[PDB]
Structure 1
Amino acid sequence: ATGDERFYAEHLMPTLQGLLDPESAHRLAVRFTSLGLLPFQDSDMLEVRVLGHKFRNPVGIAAGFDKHGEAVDGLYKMGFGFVEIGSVTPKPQEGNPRPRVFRLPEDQAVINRYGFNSHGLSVVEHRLRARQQKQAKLTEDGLPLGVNLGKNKTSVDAAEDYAEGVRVLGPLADYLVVNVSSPNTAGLRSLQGKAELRRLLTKVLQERDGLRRVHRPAVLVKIAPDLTSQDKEDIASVVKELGIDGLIVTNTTVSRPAGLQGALRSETGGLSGKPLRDLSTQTIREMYALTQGRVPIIGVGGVSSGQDALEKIRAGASLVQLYTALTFWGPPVVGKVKRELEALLKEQGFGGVTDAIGADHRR
């Protein structure tokens, strides 16, 4: 309940929404963040050790905000415990024609169909190289960096696209994400099927294992919220079989939950924000159980509060991410989630975040 929190949520963000279309607002958000034009101290309680790293707090920025790696340091300054950039495709590509981003203010939601607009691996590679040693120190300080990998629209061999991403950006990342769950690239989600996924992930892991030790990232798979029970079983099996390091749960949904009020609810694309929240949480809950709690989960979808974050943690997430909440609360949402999360942990008798991970499954 800070002053900045209310000001941003009641006055500044509604005004910015009134003046700028969603994509323009996105571009401005990236610009301001990259320039440090931004408005809470992390306690030991919020520290998490997973994926071979220390995370000083469990609240990350989800993929899709900083697609091209332009605002990484600004995002740490915003208070995120870790930053994920991407998705990045091998070659540059423009993505879908505009308009391709839509606000649903009545639903605290967004729909997007960007279609992997990407500066490409080479540009992002040089952008990260320019701050590689700074990042090494941040990572050692408990502020890790993730790189989310996509594939080009016209690509003939999906596995080769991801392999290229591993080779080029793997050495610059604490973890990589095989994003096989964007709803805006034709045929992409079918790579979530068992046979396809096993081949794909085998190639990715081999390429990863071929990197020098200090440049060898964890590999996670990011999945949709729209999977069948069969799909989820298959993914859990393959992940355990191959020793995948973790899961990101979830991407946006192509479903349209009953009760959406936004005028733009029937736009094509992935839906994010509050209407996704519990769908995402239940997918975390299921994947945690299917993997016996032995596979770290980063929980994502509709987080805007400590309660939202804690529900995903108790469902099985070791870390969480948010993105869409920024549209409505702005940068203060990060400190807000961290403060509320700490208070709830104390209130529910947890020694820290680590004690709460998967707690719903143990009672």
Structure 2
Amino acid sequence: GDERFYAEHLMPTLQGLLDPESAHRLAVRFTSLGLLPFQDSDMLEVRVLGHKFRNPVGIAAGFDKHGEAVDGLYKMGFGFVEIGSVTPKPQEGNPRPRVFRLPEDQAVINRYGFNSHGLSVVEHRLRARQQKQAKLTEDGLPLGVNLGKNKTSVDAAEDYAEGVRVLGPLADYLVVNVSSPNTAGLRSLQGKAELRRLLTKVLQERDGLRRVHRPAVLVKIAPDLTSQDKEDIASVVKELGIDGLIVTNTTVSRPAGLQGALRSETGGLSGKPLRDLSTQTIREMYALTQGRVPIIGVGGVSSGQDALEKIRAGASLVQLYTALTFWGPPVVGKVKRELEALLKEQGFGGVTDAIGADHRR
């Protein structure tokens, strides 16, 4: 239950015994069973997206792709859980190996390619705990569902629409993930006319759900967008009343300075080398949306400082994944404790007061 023991001994031993996909699969298993090693202060509570969040630190999509470990993840101390990406039909994703740790860079590269049990399997998994989730949500522990598309699908919009219909009624928020680096053509849905048409369809579908089963809809974007792309996304988001943005997915870039032997593997890069590219993207999106569109900031968060930098830049909430793969579950408590201490040090009454604070100086 100790940050040092996990960081110095448990995790490096795990890395020497198992390949990363296997270590991840085992992680999901242990978590699902609640076999895990902090008290949330009122300071960490945030109200956004039509919900209370008892703390602003969520688990990013990709860790629990199939909704198998939701309860274990709340136990781990996350203020909110996002599952997925989930695709309409089951699909296997890319051949293995398809995930790689770069320990010298505190980074991961992955090219899973949306391996997914599919909508029906995840629907029944969530239904089995639907009321337990209703209580968790009411208690300040919301659930997000991240929607993907099948590799061979002709009609991307219809895949997302199917996801809204099937998992929308079970989610506090949905994510239209148009930013995986590992599905051909996917990120091009980030363009203006394509995006407007896609999102109009998604929102129509969401609006057609009964009120108690009607989730917020967020769009998750890449860190690799052009200025024009970001400008266009901000315009469409405001035009359509999209509920929020998730900023960012992994990067296809390979920043100068990566040391890991595996740095030239194909896929999206996450962890520390992504951190500041993500923060700057949050900063840009917040400004372009006039601070009126909630942002979930993600990419390279491994400490309270990392979290607060994203919050100050415009994020109402943050998520992490890659940090867990190096530091294990104690990183969650660490981030929260550090964030609380920094908020006090910087004169903020709570997280809410810090949201977008850089933009006001």
Structure 2 unaligned spans of 5+: none
Deviations 1:281-316 (A, max 9, x none): 000000000000000000000000000000000000
TM-score (structure 1 length as normaliser): 0.99
Aligned match of 1:70: 68
Deviation at 1:327, TM superposition (A): 1.0
Deviation at 1:161, TM superposition (A): 0.0
Deviation at 1:200, TM superposition (A): 0.1
Whole-angstrom CA distance in 1 between matches of 2:211 and 2:351:
29
Whole-angstrom CA distance in 1 between matches of 2:27 and 2:207:
36
The percent of aligned pairs where both chains have the same amino acid is 100
Deviation at 1:41, TM superposition (A): 0.3
Deviations 1:113-155 (A, max 9, x none): 0000000000000000000000000000000000000000000
Whole-angstrom CA distance in 1 between matches of 2:114 and 2:313:
30
Deviation at 1:83, TM superposition (A): 0.1
Deviation at 1:222, TM superposition (A): 0.1
Q: Secondary structure at the match of 1:147?
A: strand
Q: Secondary structure at the match of 2:290?
A: coil
For 1:20-35, list aligned pairs within 5 A.
20-35=18-33
Q: Secondary structure at the match of 1:96?
A: coil
Q: Secondary structure at the match of 1:167?
A: helix
Whole-angstrom CA distance in 2 between matches of 1:332 and 1:103:
19
- Which aligned runs of 4 or more in structure 1 are off by greater than 3 angstroms? none
Q: Secondary structure at the match of 2:220?
A: strand
Q: Secondary structure at the match of 1:275?
A: helix
Deviation at 1:40, TM superposition (A): 0.3
Aligned match of 1:110: 108
Aligned match of 2:291: 293
Whole-angstrom CA distance in 2 between matches of 1:253 and 1:125:
30
Q: Secondary structure at the match of 1:137?
A: helix
Whole-angstrom CA distance in 2 between matches of 1:101 and 1:8:
21
Deviations 1:247-267 (A, max 9, x none): 000000000000000000000
Deviations 1:223-258 (A, max 9, x none): 000000000000000000000000000000000000
Whole-angstrom CA distance in 2 between matches of 1:291 and 1:196:
20
Deviations 1:259-283 (A, max 9, x none): 0000000000000000000000000
Deviation at 1:197, TM superposition (A): 0.2
Whole-angstrom CA distance in 1 between matches of 2:39 and 2:298:
23
Whole-angstrom CA distance in 2 between matches of 1:298 and 1:222:
9
Deviation at 1:68, TM superposition (A): 0.2
Q: How many residues align?
A: 361
Aligned match of 1:182: 180
Deviation at 1:64, TM superposition (A): 0.1
Q: Secondary structure at the match of 1:103?
A: strand
Whole-angstrom CA distance in 1 between matches of 2:224 and 2:208:
33
For 1:261-300, list aligned pairs within 5 A.
261-300=259-298
For 1:65-214, list aligned pairs within 5 A.
65-214=63-212
Aligned match of 2:54: 56
Whole-angstrom CA distance in 2 between matches of 1:305 and 1:323:
12
Q: Secondary structure at the match of 1:125?
A: helix
Whole-angstrom CA distance in 1 between matches of 2:312 and 2:15:
34
Whole-angstrom CA distance in 1 between matches of 2:18 and 2:254:
25
Q: Secondary structure at the match of 2:2?
A: helix
Deviations 1:33-69 (A, max 9, x none): 0000100000000000000000000000000000000
Q: CA RMSD in A?
A: 0.4
Q: Secondary structure at the match of 1:320?
A: strand
Aligned match of 2:337: 339
Deviation at 1:334, TM superposition (A): 0.2
Whole-angstrom CA distance in 1 between matches of 2:33 and 2:263:
33
Deviation at 1:352, TM superposition (A): 0.2
Whole-angstrom CA distance in 2 between matches of 1:21 and 1:303:
23
Deviations 1:63-122 (A, max 9, x none): 000000000000000000000000000000000000000010000000000000000000
Deviation at 1:178, TM superposition (A): 0.1
Structure 1 unaligned spans of 5+: none
